[PDB]
């Protein structure tokens, strides 16, 4: 019997040369090849590179120098997470990512801590991919000069660390099935909602290159392309360049997600996971147990193939993997239909390089960011195919422009019916883990009434750029005063209170766009503009959250409409529950931007 | 509603002092203290050794010296796994123990790879719990010198290879939650035996400490007792003493496994994980959450607290933890029952230390033992109770001696009612991850019709410890001429025919002493016995496989009790079915000896 989808409710993700989702976007859909040489605050190339890869394994050296890069890789706001600077340095900056990022996912989701304590008592599962190690390997050369450092990476401490930040119950693992390790984390965070571990689930993974024996080691397994490149499904494919990431998505039930008016970026209808068994060999990928584990995910979902429109593939760009990932599809696919050439194909490795833990989470951002713009982007190194894979005999197309994606129509019998955009996504581990989803796009204020705007952060500093920020977000969104009431409300219950707080009352999105403005211009008396610390007025703060009597009074404030003297307090420290403003149509959360961490650089010292 | 429990129908385990499960229960029994001083094998003293804690920890120093370790760590049979001596160099050692455990885990059971394939469709799935590194910190030393060596730990590796080797296509993950490593992989395992995920699963966990920065970190987190003790709930208990150990479990749900005729161990009714969430600090557990724990898997299992009769403890004798524990504890018995004094409580550690990944399937074993043998064992360094734990006010009693398990008694409505063994067992890690599991007891030949006894091994050498082995069993286990039949069987479809055979025709059990111990002493010309490698007929033996006509005449070998026509040929390469020898009562699997690896020493050179 099928099951009720999982809704993805929020996402947050950093990628090469993609700060944020929105610039991810921007690159895909421009095709852009974001390989770089690796940069040398990472490792010198000096003793370490080798052209020639045979000589290269024979020195300990790398004949690879390239790969996908995060920026701010070593960055950290260690003073937000209740962290020590030195602590923060001890820190492998894998679970650094990850904690920010789950901070982020949040966000997006429009939920805070405290609502995830009081609505769902903090029964919030944690499953977080990661692999690298490598940050320990620096420790003994520290230890010899006498350095009381040890660096280490804890895969437990991955998602342990957030759950208690975060302050969750729900399990708390870490996975690590290899190159499918996210998107093994999806699938176990689906199936420990559908058995009632949890009631949400962060879901994701990280994965960074902080070591040059890490491309040593992929040079002696001679898995490292001589040219630098993921040519996924491209004549001369001949092995992957590396690449780094970090992402996560907030998963709900859909029936749930619908019901307290979550945003929904796309749809979960199916998860699978399985393990080649015995092959030629520990690396060598079996595409009959593929077969069998995408087959399990469109049964899973209730889904038939000829309606499957789009699959980020796999797609690491080898002569002997290519093809054993087609073969693997298309006998999933056959048991449904004979049709050819009606299904777009693609891997964002040949963009950004493979993201091992984290190549699952950084496909399905591509996924959903495609189903959000309804376009496929092109797929990268592959203008002339691998010509050893009968593309033409199959359903598959690669990819090779920016394209509308469009509806699909089958013949449910004799009627034509449009079907929504359906994607799947593969990720194969090295050691024959192997992982399977199946996404679905989802198909869903005046002078007299003002909107509420309020925005908080740790200190002035981190404050302007959030009102930076926020002032980007609203043109690159092309909001307007209809959107207002969803900027607010998702500002207002979707945002933790800090320290430092900003607080407007406005009639439409012109005028909060001037007012912030002028606040970033370093104009004062701005009109229903407020400012203040939660410091100033925390003794009486306290008095009024535990006193029913002064709690009465500031509800009385809200329904009459005493903003003025609201707002005062609130910036103030006082804090409320800004659900009571409405009294029945409640508003949408939305995407906002999340918190803007101090990049404040915590990287090991020279040995 | 509650779900069918999980049957235990196979184990193994190596533990410190202990190269076999008897062994451990011999120790267990005794109440042996297993803690010893670091082999000099593992890292020399000096320069690492303090016994001042405060001045080792500002020196990069280890103020503790002592652990539980398991012999032969770095001990494998690389042949027999189709690896190289250059391959099981480059392998974690916890690696190679967990790959051989889980080949014996499968012969205890009495399966073989065929089996699983033909009879399960190699659903089986692996979850191991590991959280060890180290073994990759001699790298960088190693490669100064220009040694082309790798040590690395892979987790993902840790079970990938097991499925690679065993030809199994189910989920095959670790689990890395620090200290409940072991113990929520069999509540993984269990909860994807219930979710379809497969049929079968291998659970446990692997723990050695191969570097001595692991006891150097331990130091300046001071969670190492100075006294290199586990004092589990006793005066005094100031830290924990690391140990080291292996074990794996084979699960199955209870219907199947009666249906197959399997052996059972025991009963899994339930099992939970959580997570502690936000508390004081990182490390600090939550005595809320471990109670809604533990409440949480009793409810599943339908388990009324006053019919637990013993839990295995945490118990790593801290100061805070143990206290803690027990806090945890009565706050979920104490919404069943307010009687006090009724249930033993101990904790292994206490014996062989803390085995941190592994110490969840060790405390396993050790309630399977107890159950076996229906006996309560001595958990030590609790002469003195801790002092702050008012243990008269709550079900709890620490076990200081051996002594009969009873069956307990409990009113179901007026009426005396005796209940089964039930058990408890939470294992906690540092990190917050916590789990706990319910386990229950399970309460259930002559010359004219001779046994066939085979025995196989990959040489001469291995097929002689074969024997002496099982001639040590048969005198251990205390077999009459009753469970011949059962042996036969077992070593029949429970073992893999492998290159160097042996096979008997045997009518009583102390003729197969006899024949064994011929057979060790030189004896030849023995009656009815045969010896041969599966090499010297094997172009006939291919032949007769493949062909009708030729297996129809051995089948009426069989049904004719041709057996010295039919011993002759399966010692000389020809397989057979041996169930075709039954018609309709088929013996049952029992616990014999597993494959007595060549015990070969692979650890890196010195640098």
């Known amino acids: 019997i099928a099951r009720e989808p999982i809704a993805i409710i929020g996402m947050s993700g950093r990628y090469p040369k993609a700060r944020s989702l929105n610039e991810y976007w921007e690159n895909l859909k421009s095709g852009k090849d974001c390989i770089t040489?690796?940069?040398?605050?990472?490792?010198?190339?000096?003793?370490?590179?080798?052209?020639?890869?045979?000589?290269?394994?024979?020195?300990?050296?790398?004949?690879?120098?390239?790969?996908?890069?995060?920026?701010?890789?070593?960055?950290?706001?260690?003073?937000?997470?209740?962290?020590?600077?030195?602590?923060?340095?001890?820190?492998?900056?894998?679970?650094?990512?990850?904690?920010?990022?789950?901070?982020?996912?949040?966000?997006?989701?429009?939920?805070?801590?405290?609502?995830?304590?009081?609505?769902?008592?903090?029964?919030?599962?944690?499953?977080?991919?990661?692999?690298?190690?490598?940050?320990?390997?620096?420790?003994?050369?520290?230890?010899?000069?006498?350095?009381?450092?040890?660096?280490?990476?804890?895969?437990?401490?991955?998602?342990?660390?957030?759950?208690?930040?975060?302050?969750?119950?729900?399990?708390?693992?870490?996975?690590?099935?290899?190159?499918?390790?996210?998107?093994?984390?999806?699938?176990?965070?689906?199936?420990?909602?559908?058995?009632?571990?949890?009631?949400?689930?962060?879901?994701?993974?990280?994965?960074?290159?902080?070591?040059?024996?890490?491309?040593?080691?992929?040079?002696?397994?001679?898995?490292?392309?001589?040219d630098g490149q993921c040519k996924s499904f491209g004549q001369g494919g001949n092995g992957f360049v590396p690449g780094e990431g970090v992402g996560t998505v907030l998963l709900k039930p859909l029936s749930k997600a619908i019901a307290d008016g979550d945003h929904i970026y796309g749809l979960i209808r199916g998860t699978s996971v399985n393990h080649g068994g015995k092959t030629n060999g520990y690396t060598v990928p079996n595409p009959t147990a593929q077969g069998e584990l995408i087959r399990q995910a469109l049964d899973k979902a209730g889904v038939h193939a000829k309606t499957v429109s789009y699959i980020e593939a796999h797609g690491t760009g080898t002569e002997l993997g290519d093809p054993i990932e087609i073969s693997g599809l298309?006998?999933?696919?056959?048991?449904?239909?004979?049709?050819?050439?009606?299904?777009?194909?693609?891997?964002?490795?040949?963009?950004?390089?493979?993201?091992?833990?984290?190549?699952?989470?950084?496909?399905?951002?591509?996924?959903?960011?495609?189903?959000?713009?309804?376009?496929?982007?092109?797929?990268?190194?592959?203008?002339?195919?691998?010509?050893?894979?009968?593309?033409?005999?199959?359903?598959?197309?690669?990819?090779?422009?920016?394209?509308?994606?469009?509806?699909?129509?089958?013949?449910?019998?004799?009627?034509?019916?449009?079907?929504?955009?359906?994607?799947g996504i593969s990720s194969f581990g090295a050691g024959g883990s192997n992982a399977h989803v199946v996404i679905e796009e989802y198909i869903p204020v005046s002078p007299q009434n003002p909107a509420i705007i309020v925005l908080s952060a740790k200190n002035k500093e981190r404050l302007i750029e959030q009102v930076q920020r926020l002032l980007a977000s609203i043109e690159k969104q092309s909001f307007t005063d209809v959107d207002l009431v969803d900027i607010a409300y998702t500002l207002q219950v979707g945002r933790e209170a800090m320290e430092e707080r900003l607080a407007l009352m406005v009639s439409s999105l012109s005028e909060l766009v001037e007012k912030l403005q002028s606040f970033l211009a370093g104009d004062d008396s701005i009109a229903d503009l407020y400012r203040g610390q939660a410091k100033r007025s925390r003794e009486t703060a306290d008095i009024f959250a535990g006193d029913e009597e002064l709690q009465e009074a500031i509800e009385k404030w809200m329904q009459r409409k005493k903003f003025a003297k609201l707002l005062d307090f609130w910036v103030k420290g006082l804090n409320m529950d800004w659900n009571k403003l409405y009294d029945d149509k409640k508003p949408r959360r939305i995407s906002l931007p999340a918190y803007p961490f101090a990049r404040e650089h915590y990287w090991l010292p020279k040995p």
């Open 330 to 423: 298309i006998q999933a696919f056959r048991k449904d239909t004979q049709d050819t050439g009606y299904c777009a194909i693609g891997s964002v490795k040949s963009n950004i390089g493979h993201l091992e833990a984290a190549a699952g989470i950084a496909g399905v951002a591509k996924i959903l960011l495609q189903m959000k713009h309804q376009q496929l982007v092109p797929s990268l190194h592959a203008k002339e195919l691998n010509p050893n894979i009968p593309f033409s005999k199959t359903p598959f197309v690669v990819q090779q422009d920016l394209v509308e994606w469009k509806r699909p129509l089958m013949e449910v019998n004799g009627v034509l019916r449009e079907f929504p955009r359906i994607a």
């Open 37 to 226: 040489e690796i940069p040398e605050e990472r490792w010198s190339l000096d003793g370490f590179f080798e052209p020639d890869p045979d000589k290269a394994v024979a020195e300990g050296k790398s004949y690879g120098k390239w790969g996908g890069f995060v920026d701010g890789f070593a960055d950290f706001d260690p003073l937000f997470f209740n962290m020590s600077p030195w602590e923060a340095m001890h820190f492998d900056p894998q679970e650094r990512l990850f904690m920010e990022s789950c901070w982020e996912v949040l966000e997006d989701a429009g939920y805070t801590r405290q609502q995830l304590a009081e609505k769902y008592n903090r029964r919030v599962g944690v499953f977080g991919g990661i692999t690298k190690t490598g940050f320990s390997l620096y420790g003994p050369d520290l230890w010899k000069q006498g350095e009381l450092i040890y660096p280490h990476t804890s895969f437990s401490s991955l998602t342990n660390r957030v759950s208690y930040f975060l302050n969750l119950q729900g399990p708390s693992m870490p996975i690590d099935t290899m190159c499918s390790a996210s998107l093994t984390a999806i699938h176990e965070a689906c199936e420990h909602l559908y058995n009632g571990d949890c009631e949400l689930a962060i879901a994701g993974g990280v994965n960074l290159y902080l070591h040059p024996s890490s491309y040593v080691f992929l040079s002696a397994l001679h898995m490292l392309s001589v």
